[PDB]
Structures are given as C-alpha cells and as structure tokens.
Amino acid sequence: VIWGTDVNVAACKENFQRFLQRFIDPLYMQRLGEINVIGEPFLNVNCEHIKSFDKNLYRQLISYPQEVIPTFDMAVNEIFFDRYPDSILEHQIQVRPFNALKTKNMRNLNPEDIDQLITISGMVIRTSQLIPEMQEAFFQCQVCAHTTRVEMDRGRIAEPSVCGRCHTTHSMALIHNRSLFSDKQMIKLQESPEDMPAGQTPHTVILFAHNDLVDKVQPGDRVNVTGIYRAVPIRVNPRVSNVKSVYKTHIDVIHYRKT
Amino acid sequence: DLKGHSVREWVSMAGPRLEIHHRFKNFLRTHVDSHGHNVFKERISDMCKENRESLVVNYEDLAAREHVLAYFLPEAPAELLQIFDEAALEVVLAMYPHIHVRISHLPLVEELRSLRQLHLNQLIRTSGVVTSCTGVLPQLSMVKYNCNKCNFVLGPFCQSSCPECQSAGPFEVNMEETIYQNYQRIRIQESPGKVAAGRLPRSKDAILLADLVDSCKPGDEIELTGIYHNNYDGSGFPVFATVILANHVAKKDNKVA
Amino acid sequence: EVRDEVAEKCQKLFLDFLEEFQSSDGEIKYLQLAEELIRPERNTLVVSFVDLEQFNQQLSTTIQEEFYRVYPYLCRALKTFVKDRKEIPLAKDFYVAFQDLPTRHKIRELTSSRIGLLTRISGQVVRTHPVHPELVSGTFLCLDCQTVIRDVEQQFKYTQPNICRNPVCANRRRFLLDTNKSRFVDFQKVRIQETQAELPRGSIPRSLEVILRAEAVESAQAGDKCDFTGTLIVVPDVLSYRLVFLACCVAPTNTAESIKNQMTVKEWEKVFEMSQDKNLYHNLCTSLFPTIHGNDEVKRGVLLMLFGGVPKTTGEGTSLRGDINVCIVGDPSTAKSQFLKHVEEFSPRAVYTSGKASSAAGLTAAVVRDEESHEFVIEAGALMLADNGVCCIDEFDKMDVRDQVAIHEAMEQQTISITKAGVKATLNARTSILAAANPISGHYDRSKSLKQNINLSAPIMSRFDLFFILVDECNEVTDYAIARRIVDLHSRIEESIDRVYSLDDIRRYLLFARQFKPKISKESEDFIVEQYKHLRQRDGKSSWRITVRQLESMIRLSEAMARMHCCDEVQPKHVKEAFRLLNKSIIRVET
Ligand SMILES: Nc1ncnc2c1ncn2[C@@H]1O[C@H](COP(=O)(O)OP(=O)(O)OP(=O)(O)O)[C@@H](O)[C@H]1O
Ligand SMILES: [Mg+2]
C-alpha cells in the first residue's frame, strides 16, 4: 500500500471496477452507455451505493479521496475501453462521487476531517469570475529571445534569473499567453439555515471548482455539495516565507447536487 | 548632411544636426527674400519691440531655399523646431541682449477624419472649429515612486501598497517628469458643411503653451498647425491620449472666405 | 536572436498563401484586397480561413492552434506582401482580419484551454468604452547609462524594462520613456454578453470584455448583436489574471431566395401553404393568442406590428420608418401585461420591461462612469438591445421625464444621439414599441378626450401609430366567456390553447415574409388617397385629430398587410382593412 494508507492500487481498482459492473438498485453500466452516446466524460455516483456494496471501500474512499479517485477513473476508463472499446472523446471518463457522509452540521466541523471527503447542504451566497491559474509558465530571455518553459513550479513560479542560450543575468521573463492556464472558480457558500439548531452565528465556507464544474451553481441556490475539505497555510507576508500556525480552510468541490 | 537611414535618427546625429543648425543660422540673416529686406532681422526687431519670443516662419521659404531642412521638418518636427528655436534665440540675444519659432504656410491641410496613425508624432496643418477652451493650466507633472522595501518603482502619477511586495511605506520618487509647464487645452471639431454626411463631426484636442497662449476663442473657425502626437492624460497607469501640440495657429476671418 | 521555425514556416506559407492562392477566376484576390488596402484609413486585410486551409490545411490548423503566437508574423508577412506591391506609406500598421471559421462557440464554452488559439463567437454588446491609444512596442532608456532600451513590448500593463540595455550598468529602476519612438495602437474596451437564444432561462449571462483595434474599433456599437473572430487571452490585474477576447474581425449576428433554399422542404411547404392560406389573418391571431377572449383588434394590430411596413430611405438620405409604434390604454387587469408577455414569449428580439424600471440606462443608451476605471462608458439600454426588434414596455403611463424625452427623440428619429461629459455617439434603433398604459384615475373616461385619459405628451401621441382602449364592460357574456377561457386554461392545464399554426411555423413565415418588400400599386395609391379623403372628410369628435401622421401610419400598415400575404405589390384589400383598423381605432369622445 502507499504510505500512511490502507490502499492498494490494483485491489482497490478491482473492488471499484467490481462495484461498477456488479450492482443492484447495474445502472452504472447503463449510464456508461448513455455517456458513450452523449460523451459527457463524468460519472456521478452516490457514495452510499459504495457503502451498501462495500463499507470498507466507502470507508477507504472517505479516508483517502484524493489518493483513491484516480484509481476509480482508471477502473472506469478501462471499462469504457472494454464496452464500446473504440470511441471518440475529448477526454476519457471521470468520476464525481457524492452523498457519502451528511455532516450537515457545518458549524460543527473538526480538523479530523482534513483531506477526507464530506457532503454538506447549504446555499451559495457569492461567486466570482473564473480565475485562469497558471500550471506551466512560458518564459523567454529578454536579451537573446531564448524561449523556455517552467511546468507546475509548486504553486509559485521559480524565476530562472539567468538565460539558457546566452546565460546572461535575469532576463527570462514570463510570457502570459504562451503559458498554460487552468480555470478555477471561487465560491462562498453559507450553511443551510434550517439545519442550524441555534443559528446564533450562521457558518460560512469557501469553495474552489478547479478546471471544470465551473458556473454550474448560480448564487442563492440551495444545493448539496460534496468535496475534499482542505487547509492551507497563509504567509505572514508575501515577501517572507513565514506562515501562520492557524490554517485557513476551504473545500475543493468534487460534485454538486442541486436541491 | 542628408540621406541617412531614418530622418529622426539622422537629425539625432550631431554632425548633421549642427550642420543644419549653422545652415539655419545662416538662413536667419541671409534670407533677405526677393524684397531684399533681411526679413528675419525685421522680425527680430519686431519681436524684440515687445519681447514676444515667437517667430512666424513660412514653410515655403525653408522649402525653397533650404529644401532639405523643410523636407526633414515633418519627419523631424521636434528636432528641427528646437534647432530653429535655439538659432533664433542666439540671433535675438546677439542683436538685442528663450525664443520660440512657429512654422506656417504648411503645404498640406488635413481634416480631423483624414488624420490617422500614419501621421502620428508629426507636424500637420488643418482647419477646424473650436468647440471649447479652458484656462492656462499651471503644469502637468508625472511622479514615479521607488518602493519602500522592494526593488520596484510605481508608475507615473499625473499631478497639476507596492504591487510587488505591498509595502505600506511612503515610497521615494525614483523619477519625476514635468511636461506642459504652462498650458491651455482646447477642442476643435470638423467645420459645419464639411461633415461626412450623417457621421458625427470628428473632434481633436489642441494643447497650446506660451507660444500660443489664448490665441483663439471658443466657437471660432481657425487654421491650426501642430504636432499630432501621443501623450499622457490626467488619469492603472495613466492613459496615453493623442493630441495636437499647437505649433502655429491661424484664424479664419468671418468664418466664410 | 532566437527564431520560431514554426512561426518562420507559418509566415512563409502564409506569405505563399497571400502571393499564390487565388479566386475561382484564378486571380490573387488578396492582391486586390491589398490593392484596395493601400488607401488611407485601410490597414486590416481580410482573409478567409477556409481559403488558407485549402492552400495548406496544416497552416490553417497551426494558425488556429497558435493564432496569437503566429499573428505578429502574419502582419509582418502582410507588410512584405503589401510594401513591394504598391507605393504604400513606408510605415503604417497593417493587420490581418480572419473569417470563415465554423467553430462558433458560446460564451459558456470559453476556457483557459482556448487561450491563444483562434475562435469565433457571437454575443450582444452591453457597454462600449472610448477609444484609447495604447503602447505596443515600448521604447525606453535607462537614466544612468542612457542606452535606448528599444521596443520593450508591454503585456497590456506598465511593464518597464527589466534591466539596462547596457550590460555594464544595472540601474534597473530609472528607464525613461520615449514618447514618439514607442509604437502605439488604439484599443477600445467593450462589454458583451450571451445572446438570449443561447442563454438558459433564468441564467445570468457570462459577461465578457473585448478589445477592438484598427478598423474593428468602431465596427460594432453599443447594444448591438455581432459575431467576432479572434482569440481569448489572459490579462494580469491588481499573479492574478482576467480574460479578454481580442477580436480581429467583428461581423453582425446573421434574401427571400436564400432563405427559401436554406429553408427545408417541409418548412418551405408549410410557409408556402401559409402564404397561400387565406384568412391567415384571423387564424394567426387566434393561434398567437390562445388565452385571450375578444379584443381581436388588439390582436390584429399587434400582428401588423409584428410584420411592420417596408422602411424607405429618400434620395435626400432621409430615412422613412418601416416598423411602427402601437400603444394600449386599459382598465386595471385586462391582459395588457398578458398581451406583452405573449408577444415577448413568442418573439425573439422582443424584450419586456417597465417604465418604472429604475435602471441607469433608462431603457436606452446612457453615459456613465465606469465603476472601477471611472471613465464614462456608453452603456446600452434595453431599447438598444432590441435594435431591429421589439420592446414590450410596461407602465408606459408611469415613465420618467428623462426616458420620456429620450424615447420621444428615439421614435421621432429612429435613432438616439447621446452626448454628455465630452463623450458623444449616435446609435440606430429601428424598434417597434408596444406601449402599455392605464387611464388616469385607473378607469378610462370615454366621455373625456384621450389627452385627459393619459398623461403622455402630444408628441408621444403623434408618433404612436395606433391606440387601443380596453374598458371593463359590465356585459356578463364577455365576463362569463373570459372566466370560461381562464378556467379551461387552468383546468385543462395544457391543450387549452388552439394553435392552428405552430409558433415556429408562425416565426418562420414572418422571417420569410420579412424578406419581401411589397410595393404600392397605383391602384392602391389612389385607394389609399381615397381612404384618407374619407378620413379627412370624417374629420373626427375623435379624441385626437387627423394629421399627415395618420396617413403615414396607414401606408406603413398597408405595407405590413401586404407583407402578411408575401405579395410583392399592395392591393386594395390590404388598404381597406388597414383603414378599417385605424378608423375603428379612432375612439370618438363619448360625452
Ligand atoms: N378580455 C380578456 N380575455 C381573456 N382573459 C382576460 C381578459 N382580460 C383579462 N384577462 C385575464 O386577466 C388575467 C389577469 O390580467 P393581467 O394580470 O394580465 O392584467 P394587466 O393587463 O397586467 O393589468 P393592469 O396592467 O391594468 O394592472 C390574465 O391572466 C388574463 O388571463
Ligand atoms: Mg400589468
């Protein structure tokens, strides 16, 4: 297993692929055919189906959503390469599980759920325009025009500070359009009000739809969102690498359930 | 001499520059004209009668006699104009211990619609109708602030939280520039009857300085010669507005002639 | 000193496309386009994307993929192509304007993946900023070493030189700008939004800012619908970024023969039947208005408004109205809003709104400071959005004085010239207007003149072609029948409607009928003259008198009723019915 997890790549894949084929209300194969017809490369799944089929896999899913989901896609794509083995798709199928652990007491959420999937009912309040976030930054020396690229430099970008051809001083400046970007939509959502017992201070959270699943919820819509709880440091200053001991937290959405 | 690679570059060369300056300095006395009156010497006396520091030069005279200087003049507006201004100042101080030169009789007259980016940063003449004017504004000054605790300079700030590090310090002026150290702004449009059918009349702005302070009134038709060129404006970084630096202004008497 | 061989290869093949590819005749069309481009105020060269795909499919696909990367090379190849061909002025900017791209995307489809690559899109303009010169090739010089840092291209922000051109000096912070030497180009910011057709119901459109340059600067105007070819691009803003679509070419958003050929056989047969169908007049009104009882003259007038007469431009350049303006004054309830809603629901280009609308646009174009930039922007109102369309305005009695005068200017002129704060512009708006109002004191006093019944100014009364009065009759039979219609609608949740012609078939017929331009037969001319003699002889007493404006509405109505049957000439049948509608519309003072 990968370190720190009870997760085997092959065994979990076969268990998931078994769940896709073998199931009782087999619908996953039917919507796969619908996906093969339509071409929509996503497979939204009620996680409680996996719980009923395999509580351990469901438990394994909740513990390691980020680790386990790529295996789930791998299992589904091979199934798509089995049934309708030849086809055309701009990208292969994906999976967006949901409705797993109704920890709808958003005002009661602990750091124990960090990096574990959770589903919550609430009303989106505010949104924003899609943020094109760099993933590979094209660069080129000012002096001799020596082009180059830096690819996924851990969020920040590493300034070359020296050319590659002439090897002059800091001359490799980023090229915006030539660089590679991905869409990222920020959303702020409030706790569902009727679910709050006291409601003395309604709880609010942030969301991030990355590269896809963007603008699918307009403001004010009461939906059940399922995604990966996340916490990240905050630099005390952008200039300095020091960070706070506290950790601002957000959700990277995996699935939206309109309601 | 002439026949370089670019006229702006060629006049920028010191050799041809001082050659042209001496040739125009020669022209500031030798141009006695067919009348044989030392026309420049008359104007120097006339200007020094009241110290008006503004000479009227016919482009025909430069084209006829100097030719090369006049031909480079639209291609080298600022450079040759300062060559004329410095030459005239020397003659004024010699004869009558700054002097500005205004070029007139430009062969080609244009319309506001007619002018385009091809004529950008060039002297050109046109006839329009003044739509509005203002006062002689004191000064336009652009300020750029070196950041407090980072290697950054903030952009120009027109006058009349560093984006790199967000330093809250007061910052230090890395560089400052002043332009139009005393100036009146006006607007001119296409004259009535010259409108291109249902098109709205075009409009342009003319900036005038002590060379042409308050030379007109709003609502008048005038023939103006000036440098159709780009410049900043009072507004992240300040916008670049294309204007006509008024070099020579002529009225249109009676509005119909 | 680094060359992109893909760009060199693309430039060469594109230059080959300019100087070898040719029309069906076998002549280099682009030489002729370049020959026309030598004129002043002519720098953008049109290019057909399908043509260069035929010349080299790889070249078109590579250009499509790397459009922003290769585009400067295209301009450079255009410069080489055009400079030697003729006595072009030595250095004026030149641009390549693309077209013939099938990949027309919705605004929802734009992504980071689409940055740089070319694409076509279509939307509706919202607000247009003033034109502004923008530096493209910055020319700088360090203050210390005084070496000219030449041609530092700025990525749409105040990007100073990174370091001195002199390797010895590293001042790094005091690069003074050369005003004249720096290259410039005029850019205009414009906001566009999703068209209503693409827009899902109740969904907020994806607003998009775009940049317009060269001839594209003034190509489109505020509030109009247009198609744009170009590419999306990030722009840094206060490592933040935001997207803007730079459109190289701007085109409008989409003849009887071409329509009928493009029209499918079944659609052609139905429309052909519909044109042949006599009594389509009443049948269409019944189908268009299922949940309506009586008041068919209103249904008649609206249908004529939907068709509208042929516009005419005189030899003096004076435009003459093709569409019309119709108003309704009715007691409380009485389906006026229902009339407008059905019209808006059926018709694309039909926009609903209210005179109580407190928008800063005021239903029309407005000049307003940018919320962020603080510059004034010509923000289009819903009337401008309905250009060559219809506006279903509610609360027309309760309009504002500012809207009232501006609207009066618009219908009088068919255009609006807006000028304030130095900014000035004019916009065409040939839009049918459906005014909905209620009588003063709620109920219509038929014993009092229409001027007493409504607050609208006389010029508003004059410029409106028709006025329909709705009154709450005590007649129980109408009251019973309306209740029967309503309750059947509610009880028979669907199927209560009786659409003898489907709304798409109705719309298709109107589109094809709109392709026609019916003319006035000399028979109809004297017939129209004879009708107005009766109207003039009638001389009201009418709530309003009879000027030439009544005749102008009559001829426009007759053209519409000629358009109803798709006949290329007007007949007396159209005229007499038009006289019947207007003459019946004249409500005499019942004192
Ligand atoms: N003559 C009529 N025939 C059929 N239905 C009618 C008629 N008059 C009114 N109705 C019904 O009246 C209902 C309510 O009227 P509605 O709300 O449309 O009025 P309105 O024209 O907006 O009124 P107002 O603007 O004066 O307040 C509508 O659903 C319509 O069905
Ligand atoms: Mg109503």
Ligand SMILES: [Zn+2]
């Ligand atoms: Zn280099």
Ligand SMILES: [Zn+2]
């Ligand atoms: Zn700083």
Ligand SMILES: [Zn+2]
């Ligand atoms: Zn230096």
